Write an enzyme that holds these catalytic residues in place. Structure first.
Site, short mmCIF file in Angstrom:
data_model
loop_
_atom_site.label_atom_id
_atom_site.label_comp_id
_atom_site.label_asym_id
_atom_site.label_seq_id
_atom_site.Cartn_x
_atom_site.Cartn_y
_atom_site.Cartn_z
N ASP A 15 -9.05 3.31 4.85
CA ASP A 15 -8.19 4.50 4.62
C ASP A 15 -8.02 4.88 3.15
O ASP A 15 -7.10 5.62 2.81
CB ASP A 15 -6.81 4.29 5.30
N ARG A 29 -5.75 8.02 -0.72
CA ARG A 29 -5.18 7.37 0.43
C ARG A 29 -5.01 8.43 1.51
O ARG A 29 -4.35 9.46 1.33
CB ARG A 29 -3.80 6.76 0.08
N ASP A 34 -2.92 4.22 9.12
CA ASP A 34 -3.02 2.88 8.58
C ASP A 34 -4.15 2.15 9.28
O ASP A 34 -4.10 1.86 10.47
CB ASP A 34 -1.70 2.18 8.73
N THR A 35 -5.16 1.83 8.51
CA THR A 35 -6.21 0.93 8.96
C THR A 35 -5.88 -0.52 8.63
O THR A 35 -5.15 -0.81 7.71
CB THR A 35 -7.54 1.31 8.28
N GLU A 37 -6.38 -4.12 6.91
CA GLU A 37 -7.01 -4.52 5.65
C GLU A 37 -8.33 -5.18 6.01
O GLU A 37 -8.51 -5.66 7.14
CB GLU A 37 -6.14 -5.46 4.82
N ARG A 75 -2.47 7.16 -6.22
CA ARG A 75 -3.48 7.59 -5.29
C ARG A 75 -3.13 8.95 -4.80
O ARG A 75 -1.93 9.25 -4.55
CB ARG A 75 -3.55 6.60 -4.06
C1 LIG Z 1 0.01 6.70 3.34
C2 LIG Z 1 1.10 6.64 2.29
C3 LIG Z 1 1.34 5.41 1.68
N1 LIG Z 1 2.26 5.26 0.74
C4 LIG Z 1 2.57 3.94 0.14
C5 LIG Z 1 3.64 3.30 1.03
C6 LIG Z 1 3.37 1.82 0.97
O1 LIG Z 1 4.15 1.13 -0.07
P1 LIG Z 1 4.01 -0.44 -0.23
O2 LIG Z 1 2.75 -0.72 -0.97
O3 LIG Z 1 5.20 -0.61 -1.10
O4 LIG Z 1 4.03 -1.12 1.09
C7 LIG Z 1 1.84 1.77 0.71
C8 LIG Z 1 0.91 1.61 1.90
O5 LIG Z 1 -0.44 1.73 1.46
P2 LIG Z 1 -1.65 0.79 1.99
O6 LIG Z 1 -1.65 0.90 3.51
O7 LIG Z 1 -2.86 1.40 1.42
O8 LIG Z 1 -1.41 -0.57 1.47
O9 LIG Z 1 1.51 2.99 0.15
C9 LIG Z 1 3.07 6.38 0.41
O10 LIG Z 1 3.97 6.18 -0.47
N2 LIG Z 1 2.88 7.60 0.96
C10 LIG Z 1 1.95 7.78 1.91
O11 LIG Z 1 1.79 8.87 2.43
CA LIG Z 2 -4.16 0.02 5.14
#
Ligand SMILES: Cc1cn([C@H]2C[C@H](OP(=O)(O)O)[C@@H](COP(=O)(O)O)O2)c(=O)[nH]c1=O
Ligand SMILES: [Ca+2]
EC number: 3.1.31.1
Length: 129
Positions: A15, A29, A34-35, A37, A75
């Protein structure tokens, strides 16, 4: 919402994808998904799926929603299209992503993706198997 050009730099995992957007490299992103890891079950398959989709595309497009365009890690947050097909939706449809991170104001395509998730789950695909 509007589709804007970009070019693939590098598929990263299920993702995230690095794209050149307005002439600058940036990690995107994928919104509303959510994919797993790469280390988790279906992670490698999600990564492989995203990769093939963006690498095989002649045309990559970025679609920002109405809210925040970058997250806290810098991102880009968008819907990504490969020759007009939304990668975010396709991952959910194959059961390789869950609908996730649905925040108010960046959720235009929520109900489209939830529909794909319902179809994937009905079919018992991948993460729903
Ligand atoms: C998809 C998305 C993720 N994020 C942030 C929330 C999560 O914070 P935390 O890192 O604090 O958990 C993280 C999840 O991304 P990943 O799934 O790539 O790890 O990215 C946003 O802030 N807005 C969004 O739309
Ligand atoms: Ca992910």
């Amino acid at each position: 919402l509007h589709k804007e050009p970009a070019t693939l730099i590098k598929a990263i995992d299920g993702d995230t994808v690095k794209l050149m957007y307005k002439g600058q490299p940036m990690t995107f992103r994928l919104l509303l998904v959510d994919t797993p890891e790469f280390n988790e079950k279906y992670g490698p398959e999600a990564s492989a799926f995203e990769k093939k989709m963006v690498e095989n595309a002649k045309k990559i497009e970025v679609e920002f929603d109405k809210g925040q365009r970058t997250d806290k890690y810098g991102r880009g947050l968008a819907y990504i299209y490969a020759d007009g097909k939304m990668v975010n939706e396709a991952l959910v449809r194959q059961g390789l992503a869950k609908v996730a991170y649905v925040y108010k104001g960046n959720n235009t395509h929520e109900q489209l993706l939830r529909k794909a998730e319902a179809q994937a789950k009905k079919e018992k695909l991948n993460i729903w198997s």
